């Protein structure tokens, strides 16, 4: 009569409420699989994400908390929605792993980058992505790991941002936690970050869609910076000044580039037929790209600015863009370190809170 039950997926155990059946592996979060299921009660497909003894370690514990905590208080049509949390363990003492249920979308961006979209479709997808983002920012939270694998869509052309374990507030206080290609210079050259660090990610994503391939490959964290300067060209002396001297030498030491123009980076060739009416212009896209893909963090456009931009704003709806922010329970401020015991304590209460 036990409320849960177990199933082997490879050599992973999923112990989940009987309601959830016919599991199927689907992917990984920052931490976890990630597994599609039939919620027999609700009669609809879901994604069940398992976080295996998440308090096992400082890092994990922390990410897990945020993940849970954000997943909870965040509500926006462009953020992936929570459906249920649980642990099969019966006590704080006896506790070890957590399970998260989210809605299941149709596919992640992989995927879209693949087919040739038309302006309205692309533009709109971006619009969504951005609103989603602006939601998070509107409460101070940065996503840090936006990337196609983390962005899912539905075949009615809807879109949601996903996976929050990475997500925190600005600053400094590892460099190599965010997906290598989608790393803003601030992140690559280790100088800490602010909101629009995401905007950078969005450029790489938008670009990738337009290019069909990854904007800046880069084989190692170091080669990455070559691919950036290669294309955008060497940043200003003004910018360099802000680099930690050790980094700054290596950088100044790189071969100088003027870098290609966005017209040349992004030939007309690539874009579809131009707009019905004006604003969805192949060049209008470029102009946005030009304001997003900017090495200089403080010369770089924000979500708000990007939602204003004439290639995005055709979809602008205040009820989506200027939604009410999420409230984060204020006691939580995403960095205060603890013992693995205090962490396990924290998460568990947090799961307990969230169980039905």
């Amino acid at each position: 009569d036990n409320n849960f039950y177990s199933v082997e997926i490879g050599d992973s155990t999923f112990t989940v409420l009987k309601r959830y059946q016919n599991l199927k592996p689907i992917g990984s979060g920052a931490q976890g699989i990630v597994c599609a299921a039939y919620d027999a009660i609700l009669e609809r497909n879901v994604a069940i994400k398992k976080l295996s003894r998440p308090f096992q370690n400082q890092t994990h514990a922390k990410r897990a908390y945020r993940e849970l905590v954000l997943m909870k208080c965040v509500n926006h049509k462009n953020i992936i929605g929570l459906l249920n949390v649980f642990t099969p363990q019966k006590s704080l003492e006896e506790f070890q792993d957590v399970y998260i249920v989210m809605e299941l979308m149709d596919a992640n961006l992989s995927q879209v980058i693949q087919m040739e979209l038309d302006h309205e479709r692309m533009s709109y997808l971006l619009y969504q992505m951005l609103c989603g983002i602006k939601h998070l920012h509107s409460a101070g939270i940065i996503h840090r790991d936006l990337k196609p694998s983390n962005i899912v869509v539905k075949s009615d052309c809807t879109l949601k941002i996903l996976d929050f374990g990475l997500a925190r507030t600005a600053g400094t206080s590892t460099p190599y936690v965010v997906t290598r290609y989608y790393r803003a210079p601030e992140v690559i050259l280790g100088m800490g970050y602010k909101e629009n660090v995401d905007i950078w990610s969005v450029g790489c994503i938008m670009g990738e869609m337009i290019k069909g391939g990854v904007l800046f490959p880069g084989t190692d964290h170091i080669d990455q910076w070559n691919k950036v300067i290669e294309q955008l060209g060497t940043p200003s002396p003004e910018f360099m000044k802000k680099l930690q001297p050790t980094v700054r030498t290596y950088v100044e030491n790189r071969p100088k580039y003027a870098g290609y123009s966005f017209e040349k980076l992004f030939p007309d060739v690539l874009f579809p037929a131009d707009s019905e009416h004006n604003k969805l212009k192949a060049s209008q896209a470029r102009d946005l790209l030009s304001k997003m893909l900017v090495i200089d963090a403080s010369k770089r456009i924000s979500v708000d600015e990007a939602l204003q931009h004439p290639y995005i704003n055709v979809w602008y709806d205040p009820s989506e863009a200027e939604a009410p922010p999420p409230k984060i329970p204020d006691k939580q401020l995403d960095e205060r370190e603890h013992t693995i015991e205090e962490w396990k304590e924290l998460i568990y209460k947090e799961v307990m809170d969230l169980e039905h």
Binding site: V112, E120, R121, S155, D156, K279, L280
Partner: peptide, 10 residues
């Protein structure tokens, strides 16, 4: 300038 409502994930 209508929103699309369909995305071919064939």
């Amino acid at each position: 300038p209508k929103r699309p409502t369909t995305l071919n994930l064939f």
